Structures are given as structure tokens and as C-alpha cells.
């Protein structure tokens, strides 16, 4: 084998795609006989249906030449012989992250910036929308680190992998906020085994993923499944066949319409593996088989890459689910599922077949040259790839990856990190107390439409996230120390929030159970994205998505993070309908005022914050002729029905201008409260004032 007739190593990669599948998506009646059960075949030498016999025998022979070689001698020759080996993981936890960095460049950012069929981005970082993704068989989540690092918090990841030495090392995400990721191990959630091949893990994960994606599914799935086949490397395809099927079935289970899929595979000689690729070609707008230069040249590792999940894939999903049940029934028997599509159907698509053969034979030819090159670099130890450092620098430049070492974050103290995150904003802005709402200050809530309101359940605090459980709170006074938060919860680094701590009582009296929860009032920085200058509702839109991003529903032992329910001030009437007199554990049987949330939980309210969302000289009126709200500039006298950019109240104006209507003793806000103090504003006084000033 002349390996010296190889093309000069390059950072420029070419993609060949399958043609566009012109056949309809197979239905339950068409697929009804496609599942052929035969004898368990553990022979790869005669799998010539989609590759020339001479090339198949040549690549198998070139693999088996290493069976007599010391693994450390092979590994050292391979490290000298591979032009791309100096890329490694760069600053990421492993070299798998760099495969996703490479492929997300080669595929036009379709994973990190997915598009509709009109080429428009499906996720905009300024709008309330998150990039949902999934990562399966993916421990320790190197692929996930690149995606989370690339999109910061504007992404939410869902993970499933086998429990054990190869579980998710979320602690080792030095470049990404691990709080934006949620591992789920199938049946039982956090306590499951994570077996992708097992159907129950697939089902529980499937329901969980759809629920955590507004019942739409993820924008894309990544799948990097593989296990050790030490001393059986030639049988890697046949051994991994059920894992390949379960990753493809997972794509059809949780990827949204128009979504994308990427899966690791090995060899694709068997009619079983080719029939699985044919089903993906039916189910997606475009499919390709691709080996990135970050994959080692001498191994069978390649990726199937699928773009645009079609509508009507349900029958193919439910077929592959039945085939997985059949494979599980045939475990440890002399029988196996040998076909999932008939050979006559696959070979009837000549355009699919001509790509499949050409993809296999091209891969075999390159793998044979790369195996012969490693063998020569074992025999002669003076051989080296001189361009490895040049090629590395060009690949990192091309893919937009900074050339920096993996450094454990740095440990910043919460005070120094707060000064970094505020970027020279005056610290005194964080010390401002709310104006109390009283009969003397009631006029300040004019004009009513400029305001939002929310029910408070504790004193307001600042909260900083330094990563994982390194969460600290501060009470806004320059004299006060940052205090470590004693709650079982996790937040991405570079997070700065305005919060309160609210205990959520469940039930009443002796049976009552109260759980404290983090309640976000407003947001400044979300995983290194500054949002302080965005409109209060717009900042809250980013805040609401963030709570889901850091959510952990498989972990009922964790303390919840929530966003406060924000009301329009002209709709404060809707708050009092959620006030109830409940028997709290320890109140000697005396009912206490309780605000009931969106779930079956309540807290004791302390009062109501009133926050200005419109900046001076602007204010919001209501046009009786147009039946629409409008912005009015008090200085220029201009009027518009669109939001002026200079009318936006940033965080510092919202925080400084805030009022607080305290709900202590003598204040009537629910009809069961007696007696009322005449010097204190009731619900009726505040609602009457609001009604007079709506018009």
C-alpha cells in the first residue's frame, strides 16, 4: 500500500451529501414485513453488499496487522502519523468537543444557529427563545461543552448516558456553564441507569424532553455512542448495531420538525446498518456520511449528519421502537434482527445505493492508506508529520476557536467578580431602598401604564453565580459581606440576579410542608450576557428562559429557581384573586394571608413591588380612538404606537424608581382581614386610585 500518494493535509474539508429523498416516508403497512430475523451473524468479511470485496478484505487485513503490536507502540506511531493530532481538546475537557467545533463549522453553524427552510435563524439571542439541544451516549459531554460554551446560556441541554466511569463530568466543564445542562437517566429520572438500548430509559427521557421543549422537541440531537471492542475491532459495527438503532430511534423521538441530527457510526457494510441510514434518508430533507479531520484517519469512526426532520415520521419511529424490543428479546440467543429494510428496497434506490457504495469505498481507501502509514511509522521511528503545528493553527482560526490552554476557573471571590460584572457602574445604585407606598406617595404610580407589579415574600437581595454550588447573596449595603447561599441549587458562572428567598408551603397545618425557593425579581447578567439595558419585560423574557435553562426536574432534592409573576399595574386586581387565608404550621390555628402561585404552592406575602418600566421623558397613554396604548414624549410632545428605544427603563432606573406597598398588620387586601388601620392604604384605595388614572 503506497500511503505516500496521499493529498497534502488541509484544514479545508469537503462534504458530499446523499441526493434528496424523492420517495414518501414508509408507513406501518409498507414496513410490516421489513424486519427480518435470522441467525446471529458474527462475520464481517462477506458483508460486500455495499463495498467491493477486495477493499473490505484489504481494510480488515490492515486492521488485523496491529493485533500483534503493543498498544503504546501503536499509539506513539499514530500520534506522529496523524497530521491533525496536535488539535486535541484545546481548552475543552476532551477531543470530542473539537469534533463538534469542526462539524458545526463544516455544516454552516446549523447546530449552534439552526435555520428554517427560508434560511432565517430559528433562535434569536435578544428574544425569549432558547436553543434546546440533546446529547445522548455522550459522557463525559465534551460535545456539550463546545455547544454550551459557543451559545453561553442562550442554550439548554438535555443529556442521557450510562451511569459509571463514563458518566457526565459536569464538574469538568471549565469553559461552559454546567448549570445549563440537565442529565436524565431514563426511568426514575436522576436514579435511572441511562441505558439508551433499554426502551424505558428512552420513554421516560422522551416524555421529559418533549415536556421541557413546549412539546416541540429539541432543535438538534447529538449522539456519540460507542464502547470498548478490544480484540474484536473488526466486529465493531455488528457489536454496536443496537446502540446505532437506539440513537436513530432517539432522533425520531425528540428532534422537532425542521430539526437536525448528528450520530457517530463506525463501518456501514452490513445491510442492517445501511437500512438504518436509508430510514434516516427517508425521514430527513438531507443526509450525508462525513469523517471530520478531528476523527483519527485510521479508525472506522464517521458521522451520519441529517438536516431538516420531515413531518409524518411517527410510523418509522414506532417501527424502530418495535425492532429495539425485538433485539432485546433476542439478546443471548442464536437469532438476531439482520434486516430493518429489505435489500431490494435499498438497491431499488440506485441514487442512495451509488452514494452508499462510494462513501464506503472512499473511506476504506483512506483508512487502508492511514493504517499502512501507521505501520510504516512503527517500523521507522524517524518518520514525523512536519505540518501538525501549522494545520492546528489554521483549523483553530477557521473554526473560530481561541488558542488557549484549559484553565480551571479561576476561583474569583464574589466581591471581585461583582465588580467585574458591573463594568464600572456605581455601586451606590445597588444600595437604594424602595419608596414606601402610602397615601402621601400614591401619586408616584402615575401614569399607571408605565408600571408593573409583583408580590414579594421576603426582603430583596442580590445573587451572584460563580458556577455549580458557588452561589452567594448580598443585601445591597457596601458594609455587608457576600454570604454563601445554603441551598441545594446550581447556577452558571457569570450570573448576576436580583432575587428574594421564598418558602413555598404545601398543604396546611400539621400536614403543611414548606420549601424555600429562589424567586428572581429582575436580571442584570446571565452566564456572561449583559441584559441590564433591555426593557424590564424583555429582561424578564430572558430571565424566564434562564430559569428553565438552570432547571433540574430529575433532581427533586434541589431547591427551585423561579421568576416572579409580573402583573401590569392596571391589572393589580388579578393579584388579590390569588390571596387566600390558609392555616400555616405553627400559627396556633390562626389563618395567614397566602399568595398561591402557578403550582399548588403558596407563600406568606410581605407586600407588593411596583416597578417603573418606562424612562423619562416618555410615558404610556391609552388612545380611546385607536383602542391601543401609545408612548408620549413629555419634552418633544411626540406620540408613537411603537416602543421608542430611549423610552426603555434599564435595570438601574427600574431598581432606583421602585415602590413597595408593605402588607403588615392593619392592612386590608383580602375581605377576611379585620380591623383596618385608617392611616394605611387598603386594596380598595389603591384600586380606586388606579381606576381613576387608567382613563
Amino acid at each position: 500500500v503506497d500511503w505516500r500518494d496521499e493529498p497534502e493535509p488541509s484544514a479545508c474539508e469537503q462534504v458530499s451529501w446523499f441526493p434528496e429523498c424523492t420517495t414518501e416516508i414508509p408507513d406501518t403497512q409498507e414496513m410490516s414485513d421489513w424486519m427480518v430475523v435470522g441467525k446471529r451473524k458474527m462475520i464481517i468479511e462477506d458483508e460486500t453488499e455495499f463495498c467491493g470485496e477486495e477493499l473490505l478484505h484489504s481494510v480488515l487485513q490492515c486492521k488485523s496487522v496491529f493485533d500483534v503490536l503493543d498498544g503504546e507502540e501503536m499509539r506513539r506511531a499514530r500520534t506522529r502519523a496523524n497530521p491533525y493530532e496536535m488539535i486535541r481538546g484545546v481548552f475543552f475537557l476532551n477531543r470530542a468537543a473539537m469534533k463538534m467545533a469542526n462539524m458545526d463549522f463544516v455544516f454552516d453553524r446549523m447546530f449552534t444557529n439552526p435555520r428554517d427552510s427560508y434560511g432565517k435563524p430559528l433562535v434569536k439571542d435578544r428574544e425569549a427563545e432558547l436553543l434546546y439541544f440533546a446529547d445522548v451516549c455522550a459522557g463525559p459531554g465534551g460535545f456539550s461543552e463546545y455547544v454550551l460554551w459557543r451559545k453561553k446560556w442562550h442554550a439548554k441541554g438535555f443529556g442521557m448516558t450510562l451511569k459509571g466511569p463514563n458518566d457526565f463530568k459536569l464538574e469538568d466543564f471549565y469553559s461552559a456553564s454546567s448549570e445549563l445542562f440537565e442529565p436524565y437517566y431514563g426511568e426514575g429520572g436522576i436514579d435511572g441507569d441511562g441505558d439508551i438500548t433499554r426502551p424505558e430509559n428512552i420513554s421516560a427521557f422522551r416524555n421529559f424532553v418533549l415536556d421541557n421543549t413546549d412539546r416541540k422537541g429539541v432543535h438538534f440531537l447529538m449522539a456519540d455512542g460507542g464502547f470498548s471492542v478490544e480484540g474484536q475491532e473488526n466486529l465493531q459495527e455488528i457489536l454496536s448495531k443496537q446502540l446505532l438503532l437506539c440513537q436513530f430511534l432517539m432522533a425520531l423521538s425528540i428532534v422537532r420538525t425542521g430539526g437536525h441530527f448528528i450520530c457517530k457510526t463506525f463501518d456501514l457494510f452490513t445491510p442492517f446498518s445501511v437500512g438504518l441510514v436509508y430510514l434516516l434518508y427517508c425521514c430527513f430533507e438531507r443526509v450525508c456520511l462525513f469523517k471530520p479531520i478531528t476523527s483519527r484517519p485510521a479508525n472506522s469512526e464517521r458521522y451520519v449528519v441529517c438536516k431538516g426532520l420531515k413531518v409524518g415520521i411517527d410510523d418509522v419511529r414506532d417501527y424502530l421502537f418495535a425492532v429495539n424490543i425485538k433485539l432485546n428479546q433476542l439478546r443471548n440467543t442464536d437469532s438476531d434482527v439482520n434486516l430493518v429494510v429489505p435489500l431490494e428496497v435499498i438497491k431499488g434506490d440506485h441514487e442512495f445505493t451509488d452514494y452508499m457504495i462510494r462513501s464506503n469505498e472512499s473511506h476504506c481507501s483512506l483508512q487502508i492508506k492511514a493504517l499502512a502509514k501507521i505501520h510504516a511509522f512503527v517500523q521507522d521511528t524517524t518518520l514525523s508529520e512536519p505540518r501538525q503545528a501549522e494545520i492546528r493553527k489554521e483549523c483553530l482560526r477557521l473554526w473560530g476557536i481561541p488558542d488557549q490552554a484549559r484553565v480551571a476557573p479561576s476561583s474569583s471571590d464574589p466581591k471581585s467578580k461583582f465588580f467585574e460584572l458591573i463594568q464600572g457602574t456605581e455601586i451606590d445604585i445597588f444600595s437604594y431602598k424602595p419608596t414606601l407606598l402610602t397615601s402621601k406617595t400614591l401619586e408616584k404610580i402615575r401614569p399607571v401604564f408605565d408600571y408593573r407589579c409583583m408580590v414579594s415574600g421576603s426582603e430583596q437581595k442580590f445573587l451572584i453565580g460563580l458556577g455549580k454550588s458557588q452561589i452567594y447573596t448580598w443585601d445591597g449595603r457596601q458594609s455587608d459581606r457576600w454570604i454563601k447561599l445554603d441551598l441545594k441549587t446550581e447556577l452558571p458562572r457569570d450570573t448576576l440576579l436580583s432575587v428574594e428567598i421564598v418558602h413555598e408551603l404545601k398543604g396546611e397545618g400539621k400536614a403543611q410542608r414548606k420549601i424555600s425557593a429562589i424567586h428572581i425579581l429582575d436580571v442584570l447578567v446571565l452566564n456572561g450576557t449583559d441584559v441590564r439595558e433591555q426593557h424590564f419585560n424583555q429582561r424578564i423574557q430572558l430571565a424566564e428562559k434562564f430559569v428553565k435553562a438552570v432547571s433540574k426536574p430529575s433532581r427533586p432534592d434541589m431547591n427551585p429557581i423561579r421568576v416572579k409573576e409580573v402583573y401590569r399595574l392596571e391589572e393589580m386586581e388579578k393579584i388579590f384573586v390569588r390571596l387566600e387565608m390558609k392555616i400555616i404550621k405553627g400559627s396556633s390555628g390562626t389563618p395567614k394571608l397566602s399568595y398561591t402561585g402557578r403550582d399548588d404552592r403558596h407563600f406568606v406575602p410581605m407586600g407588593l413591588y411596583i416597578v417603573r418600566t418606562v424612562n423619562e421623558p416618555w410615558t404610556m397613554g391609552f388612545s380611546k380612538s385607536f383602542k391601543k396604548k401609545f408612548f408620549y414624549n413629555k419634552k418633544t410632545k411626540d406620540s408613537t404606537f411603537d416602543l421608542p428605544a430611549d423610552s426603555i427603563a434599564p435595570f438601574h432606573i427600574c431598581y432606583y424608581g421602585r415602590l413597595f406597598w408593605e402588607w403588615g398588620d392593619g392592612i386590608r387586601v383580602h375581605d377576611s382581614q379585620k380591623p383596618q388601620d385608617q392611616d394605611k392604604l387598603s386594596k380598595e384605595d389603591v384600586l380606586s386610585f388606579i381606576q381613576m388614572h387608567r382613563a
Binding site: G507, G509, K510, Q512, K514, K585, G586
Partner: protein, 171 residues
């Protein structure tokens, strides 16, 4: 029980710390030395109410410092065997129950908790609850407990309570 008693304690003043005002130094020294302490005979020394009497200062022979016997009204607390006391739950465990009475940690083992109040980690706070889900003893609750016995360790008391008799549990 929260107690208002009179206690006697002797203060040692080196002549460096006499000052122009001598008695205020002794008052600050007493407010430093015995506040927040715990003794086995007198319990949790919460605060000193009113420093009543300042004794005559006996110059110790050979020593330099003067010694002041001081009587003082003081607010203290002592835990007692069998006293039913209100408490704040801090932690519910499968082995027992960490509650607090003032600064006192109180540990109520589940073996002296009746068979109705089972433990649940599956609730999002791990709690004590019945199968009727009526009496829910969880974190930050107001409960009542009967103090069986107290153990003082390292100049501070912790206690053990129970819920076996009637009318014990959640308020």
C-alpha cells in the same frame, strides 16, 4: 425556661486597663466575658440584665491585677427533662430530627417518634409526614417537643426531645 436570676462572677483587671473611668471597664469586661456563655449549673447565659453590685477590689498579693466580685441580674435559659417547648425545625433526617430552641440544637431520634410520622426523602423537602398527609413536619416549621435529656459538650448544651406522648408535633 427563660430565667431572670442574679449571678456572681469575678473580674481580673490588670493596671494597664484601669483608665480614668474604671467601672465602665469592668462593665464592658463583664458584658464581654459571660454573655453568650453556657455553664452546666446555670444554663445558656443569654445576657446580663443589670450589673447590681461591684465588690471591693482585693489586690492579690504578688499579682498586679485587682479582682472584682460582681453581682448581676442576668437573663439565662436552662433546658429541662420533660419540659414541653416550642421549636423551629432545621433538618429532617431518616435517623432523627434537628430542631432549635434558641441557640440550642435538639436531636429527636425517629425511634422515639411514633409510627405515624414516617420519613420521606421523595418530597422535595425531606420531611416527616403521615399516610394521611395531615401532619407535615418539614423544615422551618413551628413544632412542640418534650425534652427527655440534655447533654452538655464543650461548654454548651445540646438536648434530645421526643414526640411519643399526646399533643406533640406540629402546632
Amino acid at each position: 425556661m427563660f430565667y431572670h436570676i442574679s449571678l456572681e462572677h469575678e473580674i481580673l483587671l490588670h493596671p494597664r486597663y484601669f483608665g480614668p473611668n474604671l467601672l465602665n471597664t469592668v462593665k464592658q469586661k463583664l458584658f464581654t466575658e459571660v454573655e453568650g456563655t453556657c455553664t452546666g449549673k446555670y444554663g445558656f447565659v443569654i445576657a446580663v440584665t443589670t450589673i447590681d453590685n461591684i465588690g471591693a477590689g482585693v489586690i492579690q498579693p504578688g499579682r498586679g491585677f485587682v479582682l472584682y466580685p460582681v453581682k448581676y441580674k442576668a437573663i439565662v435559659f436552662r433546658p429541662f427533662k420533660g419540659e414541653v417547648v416550642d421549636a423551629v425545625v432545621t433538618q429532617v433526617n431518616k435517623v432523627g430530627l434537628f430542631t432549635e430552641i434558641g441557640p440550642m440544637s435538639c436531636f429527636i431520634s425517629r425511634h422515639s417518634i411514633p409510627s405515624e410520622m414516617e420519613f420521606d426523602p421523595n418530597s422535595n423537602p425531606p420531611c416527616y409526614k403521615t399516610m394521611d398527609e395531615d401532619i407535615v413536619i418539614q423544615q422551618d416549621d413551628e413544632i412542640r417537643l418534650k425534652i427527655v435529656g440534655t447533654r452538655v459538650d464543650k461548654n454548651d448544651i445540646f438536648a434530645i426531645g421526643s414526640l411519643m406522648d399526646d399533643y406533640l408535633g406540629l402546632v
